[PDB]
Structures are given as structure tokens and as C-alpha cells.
Design an enzyme around this catalytic site. Structure first.
Site, PDB file in Angstrom:
ATOM      1  N   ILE A   1       0.814  -1.216   0.000  1.00 17.46           N
ATOM      2  CA  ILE A   1       0.000   0.000   0.000  1.00 17.46           C
ATOM      3  C   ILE A   1       0.841   1.257   0.000  1.00 17.46           C
ATOM      4  CG2 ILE A   1      -1.654  -1.321   1.344  1.00 17.46           C
ATOM      5  CD1 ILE A   1      -1.264   0.313   3.676  1.00 17.46           C
TER       6      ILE A   1
ATOM      7  N   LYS B   1       5.148   2.716  -1.077  1.00 20.26           N
ATOM      8  CA  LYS B   1       6.563   2.539  -1.374  1.00 20.26           C
ATOM      9  C   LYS B   1       7.263   3.888  -1.259  1.00 20.26           C
ATOM     10  CE  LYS B   1      10.161   0.417  -3.815  1.00 20.26           C
ATOM     11  NZ  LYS B   1      10.666  -0.985  -4.012  1.00 20.26           N
TER      12      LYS B   1
ATOM     13  N   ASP C   1       7.661  17.799  10.171  1.00 18.42           N
ATOM     14  CA  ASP C   1       7.255  17.533   8.791  1.00 18.42           C
ATOM     15  C   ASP C   1       5.746  17.553   8.661  1.00 18.42           C
ATOM     16  OD1 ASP C   1       7.468  17.153   6.111  1.00 18.42           O
ATOM     17  OD2 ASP C   1       8.117  15.054   6.209  1.00 18.42           O
TER      18      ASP C   1
ATOM     19  N   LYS D   1       5.343  -1.409   8.157  1.00 21.07           N
ATOM     20  CA  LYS D   1       6.320  -0.569   7.486  1.00 21.07           C
ATOM     21  C   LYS D   1       7.667  -1.291   7.562  1.00 21.07           C
ATOM     22  CE  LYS D   1       7.389   4.383   7.948  1.00 21.07           C
ATOM     23  NZ  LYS D   1       7.271   5.425   8.993  1.00 21.07           N
TER      24      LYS D   1
ATOM     25  N   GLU E   1      -1.531   0.686  13.293  1.00 19.10           N
ATOM     26  CA  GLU E   1      -2.932   0.509  12.951  1.00 19.10           C
ATOM     27  C   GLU E   1      -3.164   0.969  11.514  1.00 19.10           C
ATOM     28  OE1 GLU E   1      -5.749   3.265  15.059  1.00 19.10           O
ATOM     29  OE2 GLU E   1      -3.940   4.525  15.379  1.00 19.10           O
ATOM     30  N   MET E   2      -4.185   0.401  10.881  1.00 19.60           N
ATOM     31  CA  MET E   2      -4.514   0.734   9.497  1.00 19.60           C
ATOM     32  C   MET E   2      -5.511   1.891   9.424  1.00 19.60           C
ATOM     33  SD  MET E   2      -5.026  -1.642   6.380  1.00 19.60           S
ATOM     34  CE  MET E   2      -4.626  -0.882   4.800  1.00 19.60           C
ATOM     35  N   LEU E   3      -5.148   2.943   8.687  1.00 14.41           N
ATOM     36  CA  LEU E   3      -5.978   4.119   8.528  1.00 14.41           C
ATOM     37  C   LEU E   3      -6.391   4.237   7.059  1.00 14.41           C
ATOM     38  CD1 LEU E   3      -4.210   6.602  10.918  1.00 14.41           C
ATOM     39  CD2 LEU E   3      -6.238   5.256  11.463  1.00 14.41           C
TER      40      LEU E   3
ATOM     41  N   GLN F   1       8.950   0.370   2.421  1.00 10.93           N
ATOM     42  CA  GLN F   1       7.627  -0.051   1.973  1.00 10.93           C
ATOM     43  C   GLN F   1       6.648  -0.178   3.138  1.00 10.93           C
ATOM     44  OE1 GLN F   1       8.642  -3.206  -1.586  1.00 10.93           O
ATOM     45  NE2 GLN F   1       9.786  -3.417   0.332  1.00 10.93           N
ATOM     46  N   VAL F   2       5.362  -0.169   2.772  1.00  8.35           N
ATOM     47  CA  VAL F   2       4.235  -0.385   3.673  1.00  8.35           C
ATOM     48  C   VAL F   2       3.341  -1.455   3.050  1.00  8.35           C
ATOM     49  CG1 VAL F   2       2.343   0.718   4.948  1.00  8.35           C
ATOM     50  CG2 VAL F   2       4.399   2.041   4.363  1.00  8.35           C
TER      51      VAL F   2
END
Lengths: 335, 340
Positions: free
Chosen positions: B31, B33, B153, B54, B105-107, B38-39
Site C-alpha cells: 500500500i 513505497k 514535517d 512498514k 494501525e490501518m488508517l 515499503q508499507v
């Protein structure tokens, strides 16, 4: 990018460009992950120099700034031992790039091995390289510095002049300080504590030095594995199974070894543990590597026997007892 | 190929869909790069949930960031306040096949993705306000004394929605971050969202994150970047058109002042050589206080009145104070009329 100056964040080198009214750029002589290295002529100092042009990206800038911190730390020491380390002259920013000006040096010890056609240099040249490397490591261990190179190999040791034996260390870009990372050295020169996933100190640079010195005399790498398991198996071939008190403390121990019902350790196509002897790798009593040194002076049985001792002391499995740079410089090999 | 043919010649892990790790994580797909690595979307069999893993590229530059990120996030996990619900949750981290892996966690999608769905025309003032309150609470939590984290950032890409149908957000990228009193770097923010104190080479603190918030809140409502400079001098110049020449006591003490300014024969500071005059690009006009909102597109809508737009301008101008000593702080910002 950067007003037509950047490509991959790299500066578009123009052979013949002039920087300030000082540097004249000859050519590109090296590419890396950090960016590039060019040869240049400095007009204020009337000398050729090497300029490291760091990528226009903050992660690579911030690594290089750490690199300047250690290079300048080393500069502020008055000892002459600092001459076995490549010299940082100045640094500046130019067209959004951090640029580190170094001295220009000749070839690396890998180059030298190519010219022997991978048949090696003499024990008398090897002793000369060994001494300077041990002194450089003694410099890097002074308490106020405490630097681990982490990437010692023949490509990273450079000759000063192509007709002489003076050498220097380069690429502190993988360096750390005691206190400050698991998958670290280059496979062929990677120490046992690193393969085993244990804490490491400045001792990992001394494991490499031993691996490197044997390769300079024979022409070929001592331990050339295609992966970690091959690397650890090719070390056991020469030195046997590691002490049981190190394995019992080793996270990645069971990727290589197993514990027997009596509680001793064993491995889990290779010669039996310990049967590839450095005594025969070096040709102690057989006239040297491939008998190529038979009758040559400085290459006696007494000589090889002394060389064997020092190497075995550098290839100690225990990073606590492995030879330290001062006492190695006192070894009889060097008399 | 290295690492037993698990790494490419960029020192990145060769991802294969379907793969099982330690009998726990079934890898679904890539999901994300980047330079860092990467993720991947992954099903955690033990915890019965989806996770984002990650995997850091095996290069030191990137491994340094990830270690900072792990330390600072683990520090936050010890704190009991519900304010940490605006920071993305680090579940755990480990070493797999000679790679550092951080499990989050996935967002959902980021506020830039949201802008690209508006076709860069903006979200409403009512949504901007919800986004703004959450971000100020996030900045309040980060300034608690034991923490004292600067993000360094903050931008729309680094703010993420929880659900695509809902206004809840979290902050995500802490690998360029630092703690007050462990500040070592001077080139530190994204050009567009970089503070004047950083542009000028001066000391900096947690106030630089507030500058960013002001720059982001104006972009969420107009759809476009406020100060979109191509380099550091175009960046400063874009700031000067809207806010004017910085104060003298600041410029007089600023190391990099003469990269941007110079003195005239009366001694006063001014730019050195295309740009509008200082102060002549007015936030009062960029937002459309009197003219129907940004480009008049909110004329007649609700909560988009002249008085709503006057309160929004006041808060943004308090976040865009040149002096970081008098720039507004998260607690007192949460107390502005904008939020009432």
C-alpha cells in the site's frame, strides 16, 4: 530540479565547471547511495582534491552531517596516528548540496589484489599493511572518539602513492560511536557476534582486520559465504564450534546450531567443524600459499608461525578476549 | 540479490503477496513505497485485525529515522491521556529477515487525497474547524513536558483520516522528529510549510509546528498551498508578500538574513531583487471574507458568513506570527472565538 541542476536528487556534473573561483571540476570518479564523488583541482591550494557531493535529500544530508562531526572530532586530535585516516579538508554548501572536500588517493587494496591476479602480496608487504591498520584502530579507540568503522574491507583501504606501502582508511559513512543496528558488516568480513545478533563494540573492526590480512597474502577471501548460514558454516570449518558461553547468550544461535542432550552445541557439504586449518591455508610448513613463497626471505617457518598466532588472536570468537590494537602492535610478528 | 534473495539491489525487501510471517501475519498487498522502504496491508491472525507493516530499507539513513520514530512513539504510549488518540498507534516492532519492521494501525486516506477529490477547490469552513480542533489537541499532547516532541514535517500528506466517511484524523510521520534539547539539524521542514525562524537559520522550538498548522488550515479551505516556493528564496519571498518584511529585532539577530534581505540607504531592511510588494497579497482577500469565500465559491452557504471569516482570519494570523515567542500555543488556540 534545483533549477536544472539536479537529476534521483544528484547534481548534474559538468566536466570543466568552475566552483566559486577556486575549484575546477575534472570528472565523476564514484557513485553511491549518498550521491557522487568527483575529482577536482583546487586553485587556492594548487592541488587535486576529491569532492563528495551529497544528494539533495534530507536523510542523506543528515547522515553526512554526522559524518562531518566524527571527521572533525578526529581532526582536533594532535596525535600523528590520525594520518592513517583520510583527511577532511573543508565542507560547504553549493547549489543545495553538502560537499565534503577530501584529499586525493591512488588505488585500493582490492585493486592491488587484481594486479597480483588474486595470488597475493608478500608477507613483508602484509606486515607493513597490518601495522598501519593496527595503529589506525588504536587511534579510533581513544576514549573521546570511540568510533567503529563497521565496513572494513579491501575496497576501503587506499594506497597513498601507487609505488609505496602507505595506506589510509576511508568511508566512515557506515560509522557509529560506542553507545549509539543488527544487519551491519560486509558478509565476508562480518564478525561472529554480529551474525549471532548480539551486542558489539570496537572488536568487530578487529575481526575484519584478521580476515583482510589473510586475503592480502593468499589473494582470496578467507570466509566467502553466499548467505549468513553459509558464512557461519565456513567460519566453523576453520575455527570449530564457538564457545558454549557465547552461544547460550546468542539470540540468533538456533539459526546455525542445536543443543545436544548433554547440553553441548552442534551445527544443524562442509568440512567437519575445525578441520580446515589456517596452518594449511597459509602453507606454514609447505612453502606458503600454494607453495608460491618457497625459499623467499622473511617467509620462513618461524615467520608463518608468528603470522598464524596474531591472526588467530584477531579471529577470537570472544569479543572480550580478542586482541586489542596496542597489544597486537606489540606482537612478535612485528619484531 | 542479497539477504538470501530477500533483498533487491536497493536493499529493499522483495514483497510477495500471500506470504505468512511467524505464523501470524498474512501479507495481503503493498500500500506504500518510498525512499524509506515499503508499507504492506497484513492480517494479524492473533489479534484478528488488519495492520500496516512498514518495512525499512536496509540503509543507515532510513534506519536512523525509524529508531527515532520507535523511541518517540513508545514514549507516547506510556501516557494515559486520550489526547494520544490523535497520534497513529504503534502496536509493536521487530526484526524479520534482517529488516526492521514497525507495525501500526490501518488508517484511510490523507488530507491531500481529500484535496485531490475536491479538485483542489477546498473543504468547507465547518470541516476545516473540525480538522483544526483535532490538530491543536494533537499539538497540545506533544508539548507535555516529559514528551516535548517537534514533528518537523507537518503537511497534508502526513495527516490521515480514520474512516473515509468521517472527520476523525491522526498524525503519522515521526521519523523526521526531535525532542526539545536534542536538536541537531537546521534544514528541517518542507519548504511550503517551513517556518521563518528555520528559513533564517535561528533557534527553533515547538512553535514551528504551529506555523505549519496555519499554512495547512488555509490550504484545506482554498484547496491550494499558501506559500508555494520553489527554493528557499522564492519561499521567503512568497511569505513576504502576504505578511510583509519581518520585524527588525528578528532580522538583526538572524544568521541567514542577508540571503534574503539587505539594508537600504536609510538603514531599514528590504528584499534583494516578479513578486508583489510586501504585505499586498492580503489573507483578507485570499480567504474571501467579503467576496463569498475562496474565489467566491461559498457565497450564500451556511457557517460561511463575514463574521465566521473574520474569526478564521484572526486565528490564522495568530499562528503566522513572525516572532515564535508570541505565536499562539495549542491551549490558547483551542480557546479562540473560531471554536465557539
Amino acid at each position: 530540479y534545483n533549477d536544472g541542476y539536479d537529476d534521483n536528487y544528484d547534481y548534474i556534473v559538468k566536466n570543466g565547471e568552475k566552483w566559486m573561483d577556486r575549484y575546477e571540476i575534472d570528472s565523476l570518479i564514484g557513485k553511491g547511495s549518498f550521491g557522487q564523488v568527483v575529482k577536482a583541482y583546487d586553485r587556492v591550494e594548487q592541488e587535486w582534491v576529491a569532492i563528495k557531493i551529497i544528494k539533495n535529500k534530507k536523510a542523506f544530508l543528515n547522515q553526512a552531517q554526522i559524518e562531518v562531526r566524527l571527521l572533525e572530532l578526529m581532526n582536533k586530535h594532535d596525535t600523528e596516528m590520525k594520518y592513517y585516516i583520510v583527511h577532511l579538508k573543508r565542507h560547504f554548501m553549493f547549489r543545495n548540496h553538502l560537499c565534503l572536500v577530501f584529499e586525493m588517493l591512488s588505488y585500493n587494496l582490492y585493486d592491488l589484489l587484481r594486479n597480483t591476479n588474486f595470488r597475493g602480496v608478500s608477507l613483508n608487504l602484509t606486515r607493513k599493511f597490518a601495522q598501519q591498520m593496527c595503529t589506525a584502530l588504536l587511534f579510533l579507540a581513544t576514549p573521546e572518539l570511540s568510533i567503529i568503522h563497521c565496513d572494513l574491507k579491501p575496497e576501503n583501504i587506499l594506497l597513498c602513492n601507487p609505488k609505496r606501502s602507505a595506506i589510509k582508511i576511508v568511508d566512515f559513512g557506515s560509522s557509529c560511536q560506542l553507545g549509539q543496528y543488527q544487519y551491519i558488516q560486509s558478509r565476508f568480513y562480518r564478525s561472529p557476534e554480529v551474525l549471532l545478533g548480539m551486542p558489539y563494540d570496537l572488536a568487530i573492526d578487529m575481526w575484519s582486520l584478521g580476515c583482510i590480512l589473510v586475503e592480502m597474502h593468499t589473494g582470496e577471501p578467507l570466509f566467502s559465504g553466499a548467505n549468513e548460514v553459509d558464512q557461519m558454516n565456513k567460519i566453523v570449518e576453520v575455527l570449530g564450534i564457538p564457545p558454549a558461553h557465547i552461544l547460550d547468550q546468542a539470540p540468533k544461535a538456533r539459526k546455525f546450531f542445536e543443543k545436544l542432550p548433554d547440553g553441548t552445541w552442534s551445527l544443524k557439504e562442509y568440512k567437519p567443524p575445525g578441520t580446515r586449518k589456517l596452518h594449511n591455508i597459509l602453507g606454514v610448513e609447505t612453502g606458503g600459499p600454494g607453495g608460491r613463497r618457497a625459499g623467499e626471505s622473511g617467509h620462513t617457518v618461524a615467520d608463518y608461525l608468528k603470522f598464524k598466532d596474531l591472526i588467530l588472536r584477531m579471529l577470537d570468537y570472544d569479543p572480550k578476549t580478542r586482541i586489542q590494537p596496542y597489544y597486537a602492535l606489540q606482537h612478535s610478528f612485528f619484531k
